[PDB]
């Protein structure tokens, strides 16, 4: 019963169709994204490169 009061948002938000890559690691589904496109098109250094 507390679950409805705990999340007003993310219940009854209209769903959609998101295009992203996925992967399967054991019992868990994980999405993979590399953001060098949003950094090298603006030519700021990327924070994943340490």
């Amino acid at each position: 019963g507390d679950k409805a009061a705990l999340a007003d948002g993310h219940d009854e938000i209209q769903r959609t169709r998101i295009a992203a890559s996925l992967v399967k690691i054991g019992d868990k589904f994980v999405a993979i994204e590399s953001l060098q496109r949003m950094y090298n098109e603006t030519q700021f250094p990327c924070p994943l490169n340490r």
């Binding site: 098109e41 603006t42 030519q43 700021f44």
Partner: protein
């Protein structure tokens, strides 16, 4: 006495649109290119931040 000879033909080759090299270039037939002096392409690159 009339004499005949044997001539062998020139070995023809595959034309340029029928090779696989034209997958790397974009081919147009510009009819009067001896009239062209120069030809230019101008890019305009807007850069986000």
């Amino acid at each position: 006495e009339a004499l005949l000879g044997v001539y062998t033909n020139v070995v023809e080759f595959v034309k340029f649109l029928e090779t696989a090299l034209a997958a790397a270039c974009v081919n147009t037939e510009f009819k009067d290119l001896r009239r062209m002096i120069d030809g230019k392409i101008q890019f305009k690159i807007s850069m986000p931040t």
